[PDB]
Amino acid sequence: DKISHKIDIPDSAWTIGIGEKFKNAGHPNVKYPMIDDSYVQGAPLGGFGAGTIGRTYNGGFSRWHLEIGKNKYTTVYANQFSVFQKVEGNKDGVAQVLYAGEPENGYLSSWKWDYPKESGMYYALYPNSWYTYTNKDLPVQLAVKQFSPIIPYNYKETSYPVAVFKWTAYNPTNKNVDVSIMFTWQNMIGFFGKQVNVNSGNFNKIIKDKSKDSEIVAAVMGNISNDNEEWNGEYSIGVKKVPGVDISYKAKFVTTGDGSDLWHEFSKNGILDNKDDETPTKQDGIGSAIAVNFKLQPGQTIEVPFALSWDLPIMKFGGGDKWYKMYTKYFGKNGKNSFAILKEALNNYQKWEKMIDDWQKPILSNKSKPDWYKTALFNELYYLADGGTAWENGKVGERTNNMFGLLECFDYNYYETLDVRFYGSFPLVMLWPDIEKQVMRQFADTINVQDSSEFKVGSNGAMAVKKVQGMIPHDLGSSYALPWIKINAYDWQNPNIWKDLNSKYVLLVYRDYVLTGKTDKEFLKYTWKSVKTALDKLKEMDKDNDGIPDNEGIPDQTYDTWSMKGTSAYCGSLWLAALKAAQEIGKVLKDNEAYIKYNEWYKIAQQNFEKELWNGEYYNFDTESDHKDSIMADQLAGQWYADILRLGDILPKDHVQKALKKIYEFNVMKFENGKMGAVNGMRPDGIVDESDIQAQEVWTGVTYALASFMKYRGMTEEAYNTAYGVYKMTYDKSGKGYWFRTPEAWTKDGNYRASMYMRPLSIWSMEV
Ligand SMILES: O=S1(=O)O[C@@H]2[C@H](CO)[C@@H](O)[C@H](O)[C@@H](O)[C@@H]2O1
Ligand SMILES: [Ca+2]
Known part of the structure; x- marks a missing residue:
C-alpha cells in the first residue's frame, strides 16, 4: 500500500477490508419480523432531508433511503466505479469493476466483477469515507475520498442531495501507465413511487460546461414527463477536467442487458464512444457513463473529482401528503436541477472539505x-x-x-x-x-x-x-x-x-x-x-x-x-x-x-x-x-x-x-x-x-x-x-x-x- 501516503485518512477512521467476510454477525433477537440488512454497510451519502444512499464497504450502492422514511436494501449493480490500466509496452490492458461481488439479477455479465480480497481497504469518519485499491494486477494505486457537505451550523449545503468522489492516482512503478476511471449510474427514475411503466420515458442527456478553468462533463438521467410526483426528477453524474486528463462518456447503455455496449469500449483502451443519444426507453433500464483517461509517469500523482446528484424534489408520505424537500429552497422545485447541484459540488468541493476538517479538528x-x-x-x-x-x-x-x-x-x-x-x-x-x-x-x-x-x-x-x-x-x-x-x-x-x-x-x-x-x-x-x-x-x-x-x-x-x-x-x-x-x-x-x-x-x-x-x-x-x-x-x-x-x-x-x-x-x-x-x-x-x-x-x-x-x-x-x-x-x-x-x-x-x-x-x- 503506497497510496495512503498520498491522501489524508485520520487514524480514528473505522476500517475494514474491501471484500472482507465478517464472521461474528448479530441478528435480531425478537420472534417478530425485523430488519436485518447484514453487515455489508457503509457511511451514507446525502444531506439532511435529501434522501440518502448507503454505499457499502464492498463498493456497491445498496442501502437506499431515497424514498423518505423507507429503507430498501438492494444493490443497483450498474452503479459503480471501474478502472482500466495498461502498462506502456504491453499489448492489452485490464479493466475491473471496483465491487467485491457480482450481480444477482443476470445482467451486466460482460463487466469484470469480483474485485479480489486483500486488495484494498474501506475507511470511514463520517461524513467522509475512503477506499484504497492496492492490487497486485493494478500497477497504479488509487484511492477515493467520498463525502457530502454535512456541516454544523450550516443549514444550506447540509441539505444537498449530492456526493463528491475525489480520486487520487499514484504510479509507484518505473513504467508509464495508462489509467482510466469510469463512473456508471443507472437512470433510476421509477425505482420507487411509480405504479406502472417503471422505466418508460426515461432518457439521458450529456451536458458539456466549458467555463474558463472549469470544464465539466455530466450525464443527466431524467424522464420526458413534467409530472410533479415523488417519482420524477433527475439523477446526474459527472467529472471536472483537470490538467493531464481527458474525459469520455457514453450517454446510454442498457442496464437490463449484458452491459457489453459499454464494457467492450472501456475494456479495450479505457475510452468511451462519446455517443449522445436522448432516445427515451420503454421497458429497458438505461444508464450513463462518465470516464477519465490519463497517462501517469513513474512517481506521478493526479487528483480528479467526480460527483453525483439527485434532484427528487417531492417526498410523499403514505397518508397522501406531498412536500418539497429542503434543498429545493436553494435549487428550485421543478425537478430539472440536477446539473446545477452537481456543478456546485464540482466547483466548491475543496471548500467543503475544509469546512468539514474545521469542524472535526477540535476533537481530532x-x-x-x-x-x-x-x-x-x-x-x-x-x-x-x-x-x-x-x-x-x-x-x-x-x-x-x-x-x-x-x-x-x-x-x-x-x-x-x-x-x-x-x-x-x-x-x-x-x-x-x-x-x-x-x-x-x-x-x-x-x-x-x-x-x-x-x-x-x-x-x-x-x-x-x-x-x-x-x-x-x-x-x-x-x-x-x-x-x-x-x-x-x-x-x-x-x-x-x-x-x-x-x-x-x-x-x-x-x-x-x-x-x-x-x-x-x-x-x-x-x-x-x-x-x-x-x-x-x-x-x-x-x-x-x-x-x-x-x-x-x-x-x-x-x-x-x-x-x-x-x-x-x-x-x-x-x-x-x-x-x-x-x-x-x-x-x-x-x-x-x-x-x-x-x-x-x-x-x-x-x-x-x-x-x-x-x-x-x-x-x-x-x-x-x-x-x-x-x-x-x-x-x-x-x-x-x-x-x-x-x-x-x-x-x-x-x-x-x-x-x-x-x-x-x-x-x-x-x-x-x-x-x-x-x-x-x-x-x-x-x-x-x-x-x-x-x-x-x-x-x-x-x-x-x-x-x-x-x-x-x-x-x-x-x-x-x-x-x-x-x-x-x-x-x-x-x-x-x-x-x-x-x-x-x-x-x-x-x-x-x-x-x-x-x-x-x-x-x-x-x-x-
Ligand atoms: O413499542 S416499541 O417496540 O418500543 C420501542 C422503544 C423501546 O425499545 C420505545 O422506547 C419507543 O417509545 C417505541 O416507540 C418503540 O416501539
Ligand atoms: Ca405519587
Missing part, C-alpha cells in the same frame, strides 16, 4: 481522547442523515419555518419519538440548534391538541383516546401516514398515560436554552405555556399525594414492557429535574406564581423521592414492583440532565456517586466482564434482572448517556470503559457487525433489537 486534535471514542463519536452521526430524515420546504400546492423530523428507526417508523429524542437529540442541539428548536416548537404546538377518536392499543387490545389535551405526544407521526399532521402514530401502547414524556419535554426545552448559551428568551417564551401545562397535567397522576406522579404497573414510559409501579427512580428523578428546570424558567421569565408553585412541588417531591428510594447504596428501581430492588442503569436520569442543564444537585452528591459506582460495578462489570455496555437491570445479588426482556438488554443510547453522566461526575475511567463496550460491539472485529446501523439494544449473546436507531446519538452528550 485532542490527544487526551482515545481514537476509538473519536471513531464512535463521528460515525454515530450517520444516523442524522440516514434516519429517514424529513425537512420540508412547503406542501405541494401550498411559511417562515421548515418542519423537521428524524425517525426513531425504520422498524418503529415514528418521527421524533420524544422519549427517545431525550437521548438522541444531542447532536442536533449541539451542532444544528436551529433545527432542534424548530422540532421543540413543533412539540409545543401539540400540547393542547385533543383527538377523542379511539384507537386499539396493540399490546392488549384495549381502546384508548388518540391524543389527550395537556399530554405531550409520543411522536409526530409516521412516514406511512402523515408526519407533522397526525401525531401519535405509535399504537402498540397508550402514550397519553406515559409518565416520562411530559417531564422529558420540559427538560428538552430547558436543555435547548442552556446549550445554546442561555440567551434565547424568545424560545422560552414560545414554549412556556406548554411547559406549565405539561407539568400541571403530570401532577394529576400523583394518586397517593407524595408529590410525584405514580407509575401504574402497566406500560407507562420508554421501557414500555418493563413495569414500574409507585414512585420509580427513573420517572421520579425526571420529574424532580423538570420541576427544577421550570422553576428556573419561571425566574427567567419573571413568572412568580409558577416559580413559587414548582418550588413547593419540588421540595415535597425531593424529600419523598429520597425517603422512598434511597437504600444506602443506590436508588431502588421503584416502590411497589416485585423487582423494586433492581439496580437500574438509568435510575438517575433526572440528575444526569440536571448536570447538563446546570441545575445543581437534585439528589445528594454522595448518593449519586454511590449509585454510579454501583451501576458500574454491577450493570457494567458483572455483565460479560464490562465488554458490552450497561445491562438495564441487575438484581443486588449480581444476576441480571429477568422480570422483563428490557431489563436483560443493554440500550446503546442509555449506556452512552450513563457514560457522559459518569464523566461529568469525575468517574473518567468508568465512563470510557462503559462506553467502550458499545463501541466494541458496534465497530470492532470482536463485536457483532453493527456499523452504520447501531441498534437500540442487544442481549448478552450480542444479538440485537431495532437496528438503525436514534437513541445512540446520545454519545454526543459526552462532548457537553
